Design a protein around this nucleic acid. Structure first.
Ligand SMILES: [Mg+2]
Ligand SMILES: [Mg+2]
Ligand SMILES: [Mg+2]
Ligand SMILES: [Mg+2]
Ligand SMILES: [Mg+2]
Ligand SMILES: [Mg+2]
Ligand SMILES: [Mg+2]
Ligand SMILES: [Mg+2]
Ligand SMILES: [Mg+2]
Ligand SMILES: [Mg+2]
Ligand SMILES: [Mg+2]
Ligand SMILES: [Mg+2]
Lengths: 129, 121
RNA sequence: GAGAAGGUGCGCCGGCUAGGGUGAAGGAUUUACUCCGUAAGCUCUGGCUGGUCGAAGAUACCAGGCCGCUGCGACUGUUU
RNA sequence: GGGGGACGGUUACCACGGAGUGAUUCAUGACUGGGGUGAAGUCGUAACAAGGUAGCCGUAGGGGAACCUGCGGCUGGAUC
RNA sequence: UAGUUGGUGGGGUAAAGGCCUACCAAGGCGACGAUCCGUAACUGGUCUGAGAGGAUGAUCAGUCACACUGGAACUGAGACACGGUCCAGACUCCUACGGGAGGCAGCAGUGGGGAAUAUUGGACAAUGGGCGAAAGCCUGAUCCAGCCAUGCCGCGUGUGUGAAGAAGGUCUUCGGAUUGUAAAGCACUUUAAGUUGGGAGGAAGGGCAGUAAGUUAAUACCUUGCUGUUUUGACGUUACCAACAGAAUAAGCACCGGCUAACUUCGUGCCAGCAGCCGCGGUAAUACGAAGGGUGCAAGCGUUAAUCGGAAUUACUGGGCGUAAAGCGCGCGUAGGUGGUUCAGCAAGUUGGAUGUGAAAUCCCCGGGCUCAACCUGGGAACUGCAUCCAAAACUACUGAGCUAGAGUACGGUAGAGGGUGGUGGAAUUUCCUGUGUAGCGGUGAAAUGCGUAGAUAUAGGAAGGAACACCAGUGGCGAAGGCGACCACCUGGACUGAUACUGACACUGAGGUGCGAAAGCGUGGGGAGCAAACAGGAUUAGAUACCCUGGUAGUCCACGCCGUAAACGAUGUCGACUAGCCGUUGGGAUCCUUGAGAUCUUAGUGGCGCAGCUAACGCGAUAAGUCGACCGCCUGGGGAGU
């Protein structure tokens, strides 16, 4: 009985970049398949595939610019039981604008740089460096 | 502790109390004296400290301390006590202002005269 | 323990207002030492409001004094 | 003269005061139970090394006092 | 909690209502904390803080509540009325003894309390109120003075030159060093304070006269423009300006061992004394008392009292629980918290916007006035809020439909000290009976108490009785935990493993509440082999209640009921998901050449090492203390005290 799916996608990513894996495969959803699209366009993974029929999977390939990986830390903000909501003024900035922060707004899941341009607040998900 | 416990029982900040329990929220206090002992300090010192016991206008019967180098304090004479915790003696929690009402300060003193109440030559 | 302690109400005269019980005029019908069931009467309970008389309304005979500490015997009982 | 009004009368409501029985809170009390401290003093040497009977935890019984023995558990147990 | 909670009928009040009354009905509130106890006027704001917050409600402003104590109404637009009325009480005073009088929580003032808080001022000129509008009259609210280093801000206490480096002081290696260009000496300067002269602004009006407009029937009156003339200031010796005198009129306070800027001599010798903590003082003290010197601040400096910081030391932002304090003894489960996956709807959360509001002051920003500043003041932002509308639809909620990965059922199949109720064994111990046999047995560092010819120990035969269950037996099993080992029957719970169908999220955790709880102990009844607290004797011992020895009772055993704690231990809450390896072992399927002492792989347990990683360290390391989620319990210095 797992209570939160999206803090389990991020846990497998953080663990596989210490076993120096390349491909990671977890079950999918219509939210996890949209978060990995955002991490690809910002650029942290190689690609992703939704390839099955009744238990649809998510196969993510990871990057290594060095022996050190490209993602160095990631934490879940709106843990189920806290539900962090932010307007555009109080919306956070990670590392002076060098990390990414993923905010579920009225116009779809987009990063903090996009919704602040459109002026739409919403709900934070994570703070990836 | 999780958030859903602190909603049910919030964090209650613990409180202190006054190290000077008598003279309730006031800087000085007068009292008449009863006895002038001369007690001995604790172990690592060796001396003979001079201690008077005062009955205030609150009705409390607390011991006090007398500084300086020589006191004219015969019994049934009013004083004016103030706080101050002497580490050496046990049970002593109050000093005594010199030169205020009856204690009349010290004599032949030329360093720090506003303490102990001495004039200017 | 305990009706602990302690307190209020109570007489006559009307005005209203709840009943209760017998009952039978009749019907049910098993037709007869039978089932139901009225009116009027008698009868026993009550309620809530007015008036009124006296120093005095359980007006007489009738009938708990109460409480606080302690010794001894568990108790009702029995004995010169 | 009526009407109406006042003043008296009387009932309702009500403060002070008076009564009984309780709670609760401070103030104080002959004598008692522990605790903390101190520096003298006496009786021992329980614990720390296998502290000279391995210690501790629960529980019962005993004893000037540390404590001892019984039953069960524990290694936070050292020699091999 | 019984006008208590509703209903009905009637009253009552400016106005809805148990506001009140008569009957009807038996409701209402409460663990989201009612009721009760203890304290306290709330708010805009002030004080700290980077912020989140934390304390606190002096002066200024808004609201409430009182006017010696307890009641009560009248009058009236509006009081249940601070200088009104009636009553009762308490307390002062008057009196011819019959009776009366009074209420500074208005401004001053006295007494008292206390560590502690001001003059029995000046006026109506200003702004305002009340009455009359006809001027005027009242005003201890206002506007002004007096007192107090009670606070913030500003200015003085002179400036330059001057080394014989003077005396004088202190220290010294006796040479000097230092106080120090500091003085003295010389040349200038005069703000403030003192003195003299001058001198605004706060003044708008009112009176009187004249004139022009509109009112009218009558520019008679009156109202209004305007003109002319006359009069007004408590402050007040006003701010401000000019002149004169002359360097004259004017500096303390704490500290100097470390935190902490700044040091050496002289007294004193465990004395006196010092202290915010560390701690100094027993004869050389950079800590006590002095003297020089020096550092900090200044018209002030120090101590005490009291809040917030530092304190991530109540941790929302921002901590912890293997051994430092801290995981309930273990389950099941109500309220509550959280929710796998596809569509569709909806718009309660959420985001964006608009409007109404959030008093003025205060804080902040840009300006403007007082010679500057404090102070005064114009414009903006802000006041994080709450409400009403409009739109968006990702996520959560709600609603409608599905899907099978969680979870559960049906079917084969194994393994087990998992429970409960009876039954039956064999070895050994003891008591008893009987034979043989005859001097010690038993015990201990060594002995003694004890048991023995009244025939013991030994030895053989027999009987009775009680409890425990060698070997197998193992880091081995099972149970939720405590616990559970003879064999068989009897009922009876759950786990594993395989195949296959079905239900279609039916799940997780759990304050309160419900259960099962080692051993010792307690109650009634059984039963009494051994062992054995209490106890008795011997020995050891300065002493020995103790260890050791010989005895020995409750108890241990069974049935029924109770108690509820343990180092109840993995000193580690339950549940779910990912993360290098290697060697073992229980049970179960696989695949596999087949003879295997087979092989490899996979789940469910149970052990030994180990890389990343974490950790104060030790050490854990797919059975985490690693990386992350959901809910719960608990910790806040040591004693006092789990009392
Ligand atoms: Mg008797
Ligand atoms: Mg007789
Ligand atoms: Mg802070
Ligand atoms: Mg006064
Ligand atoms: Mg003028
Ligand atoms: Mg001068
Ligand atoms: Mg000194
Ligand atoms: Mg804090
Ligand atoms: Mg549960
Ligand atoms: Mg405002
Ligand atoms: Mg155990
Ligand atoms: Mg524990």
């Amino acid at each position: 009985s797992m209570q939160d799916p999206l803090a389990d996608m991020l846990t497998r990513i953080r663990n596989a970049q210490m076993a120096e894996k390349t491909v990671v495969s977890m079950p999918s959803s219509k939210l996890k398949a949209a978060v990995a699209k955002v991490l690809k366009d910002e650029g942290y993974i190689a690609d992703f595939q939704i390839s099955s029929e009744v238990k649809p999977q998510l196969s993510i390939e990871l990057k290594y610019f060095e022996g050190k990986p490209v993602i160095e830390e990631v934490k879940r903000i709106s843990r189920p039981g806290l539900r962090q909501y932010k307007s555009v003024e109080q919306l956070p900035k990670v590392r002076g604008g060098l990390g990414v922060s993923i905010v579920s707004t009225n116009k779809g899941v987009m990063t903090d740089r996009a919704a602040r341009a459109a002026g739409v607040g919403g709900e934070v998900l994570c703070t990836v460096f | 502790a999780t958030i859903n416990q602190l909603v049910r029982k919030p964090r209650k900040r613990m409180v202190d109390k006054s190290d000077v329990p008598a003279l309730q929220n006031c800087p000085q206090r007068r009292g008449v004296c009863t006895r002038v002992y001369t007690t001995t300090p604790k172990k690592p010192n060796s001396a003979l400290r001079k201690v008077c016991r005062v009955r205030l206008t609150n009705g409390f019967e607390v011991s006090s301390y007398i500084g300086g180098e020589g006191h004219n304090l015969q019994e049934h004479s009013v004083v004016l006590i103030r706080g101050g915790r002497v580490k050496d003696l046990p049970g002593v929690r109050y000093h005594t202002v010199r030169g205020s009402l009856d204690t009349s300060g010290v004599k032949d003193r030329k360093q720090g005269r506003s303490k102990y109440g001495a004039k200017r030559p």
